[PDB]
Amino acid sequence: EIVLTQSPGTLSLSPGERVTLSCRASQRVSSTYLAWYQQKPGQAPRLLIYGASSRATGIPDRFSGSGSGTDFTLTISRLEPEDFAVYYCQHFDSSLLTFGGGTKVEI
Amino acid sequence: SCNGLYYQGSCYILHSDYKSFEDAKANCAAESSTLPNKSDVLTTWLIDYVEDTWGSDGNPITKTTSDYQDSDVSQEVRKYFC
Amino acid sequence: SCNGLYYQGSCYILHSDYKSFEDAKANCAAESSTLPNKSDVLTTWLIDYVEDTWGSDGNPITKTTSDYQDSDVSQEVRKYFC
Amino acid sequence: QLQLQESGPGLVKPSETLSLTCTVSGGSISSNNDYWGWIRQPPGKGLEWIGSIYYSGRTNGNPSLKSRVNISADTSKNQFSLKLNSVTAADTAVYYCARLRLGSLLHRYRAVDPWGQGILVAVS
């Protein structure tokens, strides 16, 4: 039903710059449902943002989220070495859960 | 006395468990009570408590007139107040 | 007979604007009130309403009697009662 | 502190049934505000949500797998399990048991914060 598409498959960035990752929805989706996760190789995903604007416990202030409707964005102002990982955008509504393709942050 | 909210002689009792719309209606009928009406609680202070809770109209109670109509919601599960 | 939840006299008034712990305490004190205590609400129905809302101890109210303390609640924002 | 640990075989044969059980330490599966779900990641690919369960017994699953998924929950032993029948070579993946948070009445938390370590399953 609802499909989330992340247009940029991979990005090249050096440490310290600001990165904006975009997630689009086929149909309008409310903000509270959207979430942003991060996944390093060989580890389980860890929640970064829930509700598109709220940082989870322990998430530094670098990560932030914004957007509405059919476009949401996750912005990381400072890219430390740890921040290089895969990033997923998820739609959850107490029903069918959908995950994005994912965007990888490399150089 | 009422074990929940009160507003001009209507006592609202929360049911924490998540259930569908028809399940909520059946359970409400079991306790000789009915789900809240959207119009009855739109301008009052109860709205902050009833947000994202089932209403008799068949859709979640949302303060904003804007709603995501044409979207099937029968498959969802939410808390209900009765 | 107040605009909120009544239990054993004490009246709880909801504030829907997200605030930190210090700001929540400041507002509640400005309204001649204090944030709810975990002990009085753990074993009562009030818990279902005040879960994930601030408490006097400085941590969000959680049903678990004993839980690991994250200690990073400084940067979290949640609704409060008083 | 709520930890999720997965247990099960990693040698499921074609045309057989998987048996994965996730146990939670530091919490109770009887949580009105959270569902408990299984999410599978094929090696080097995106995530896929293979199902969810509520302590009462309600089951929700992705339609493409709706026919083959039989999730179960046991509150007394505090364990939730997944059974996948008519397995095929495309099902090899790392399976995670996670908690799908729905949030309290006042705080809305729509996300899966705690994940298990994950268990890798392949086929002959």
Q: What length does chain B have?
A: 82
Please name each of the domains of chain B with its CATH number: 20-81 (3.10.100.10)
SS3 (DSSP) at C78: strand
Please name each of the domains of chain D with its CATH number: 3-119 (2.60.40.10)
Provide the phi-psi class of D57: left if phi over 0, else alpha when psi is between -120 and 50, else beta.
left
Enumerate residues 46 to 65 of chain C having a beta carbon within 8 A of any beta carbon in chain A: none
> Which residues have CB under 8 Å from A19's CB, separation 6+?
A11, A13, A75, A76, A79, A105
Answer yes or no: are the C-beta atoms of D118 and D7 closer than 8 Å.
no
SS3 (DSSP) at D64: helix
- Chain D residues within 8 A (CB-CB) of chain B? 32-33, 54, 56, 58, 102, 105, 108
Closest CA to A1 of A105, A88, A91: A91
Main-chain phi, psi angles of B62, to 5 degrees:
-125, 135
Shortest distance, CA A52 to any CA of chain C (angstroms)? 15
Q: Is B75 on the interface with A (CB under 8 A)?
A: yes
User: With an 8 Å Cβ cutoff, are C72 and A58 in contact?
Assistant: yes
- Give the separation between CA D95 and CA D118, rounded to whole angstroms: 5
Beta pairing partners, A29? none
Superfamily of domain A4-106: Immunoglobulins (2.60.40.10)
Answer yes or no: are the C-beta atoms of B65 and B57 closer than 8 Å.
no
Tokens of A39: 């996944």
Which DSSP string do the residues of A25-62 spell out, in sequence order?
Answer: ESS---GGGEEEEEE-TTS--EEEEETTTEEPTT--TT
- Give the separation between CA D105 and CA D103, rounded to whole angstroms: 7
SS3 (DSSP) at D53: strand
- Give the separation between CA A82 and CA A105, rounded to whole angstroms: 10
Q: Are strands A71-76 and A19-25 parallel, antiparallel or unpaired?
A: antiparallel
Tokens of A98: 């959908």
SS3 (DSSP) at A102: coil
Q: How far is CA C45 from CA A1, A88, B2, C40, in A?
A: 38, 38, 12, 10
> Which residues have CB under 8 Å from C32's CB, separation 6+?
none
Instruction: Quote the DSSP letter at residue D69.
Output: B
From D62, which residue of chain A is nearest by alpha-carbon distance?
A96
> Which residue in the set A46, A50, A99 is minimally distant from D48, CB to CB?
A99
- Give the separation between CA B1 and CA C1, rounded to whole angstroms: 11
- Give the separation between CA D33 and CA D38, rounded to whole angstroms: 17
Answer yes or no: are the C-beta atoms of D18 and D115 closer than 8 Å.
no
Main-chain phi, psi angles of D31, to 5 degrees:
-130, 110
- Give the separation between CA B53 and CA C38, rounded to whole angstroms: 25
- Chain A residues within 8 A (CB-CB) of chain B? 27-28, 30, 93-96
Q: What is the 3-state secondary structure (H, E, C) of chain B?
A: CCCCEECCCCEECEEEEEECHHHHHHHHHHCCCCCCCCCCCCCCCCHHHHCCCECCCCCECCCCCCCCCCCCCCCCCEEEEC
Q: What length does chain A have?
A: 107
b or e along D42-61 (b: 16 or more beta carbons within 10 Å of the residue's beta carbon)?
eeeeebbbbbbbbbeebebb
Tokens of A78: 């400072």
Half-sphere exposure of D40 (CA within 13 A, CB side): 18
- Its sign, for the CA torsion A94, A100, A104, A105, is negative
What are the residue ranges spanned by the domains of chain A?
4-106
> Which residues have CB under 8 Å from A38's CB, separation 6+?
A45, A46, A48, A83, A85, A86, A87, A88
User: With an 8 Å Cβ cutoff, are B17 and D105 in contact?
Assistant: no
- Give the separation between CA D100 and CA D37, rounded to whole angstroms: 6
Answer yes or no: are the C-beta atoms of A12 and A106 closer than 8 Å.
yes
- Its sign, for the CA torsion C2, C3, C6, C11, is negative
Tokens of A35: 């979430």
Answer yes or no: are the C-beta atoms of B20 and B26 closer than 8 Å.
no
Q: What is the 3-state secondary structure (H, E, C) of C17-76?
A: EEECHHHHHHHHHHCCCCCCCHHHHHCCCHHHHHCCCCCCCCCCCCCCCCCCCCCCHHHC
Answer yes or no: are the C-beta atoms of A102 and A86 closer than 8 Å.
yes
Q: Which amino acid is at B19?
A: K
- Give the separation between CA C51 and CA C65, rounded to whole angstroms: 13
Q: What length does chain C have?
A: 82
Q: Give the determination technique.
A: cryo-EM
- Give the separation between CA A70 and CA A89, rounded to whole angstroms: 12
Cβ-Cβ contacts under 8 Å, B54 against chain A:
none
Q: Considering all CA atoms of chain A, what is the largest pairwise distance in Å, rounded to the nearest integer? A: 39
Cβ-Cβ contacts under 8 Å, A42 against chain D:
none
Q: How far is CA D13 from CA A10, B39, B71, D66, D85, in A?
A: 36, 58, 41, 20, 10
Residue appearing with tokens 């975009």: A22
Q: What angle do CA C80, D2, D7 make, to 5 degrees?
A: 155
- H/E stretch holding D63: helix D63-66
- Give the separation between CA A67 and CA C9, rounded to whole angstroms: 44
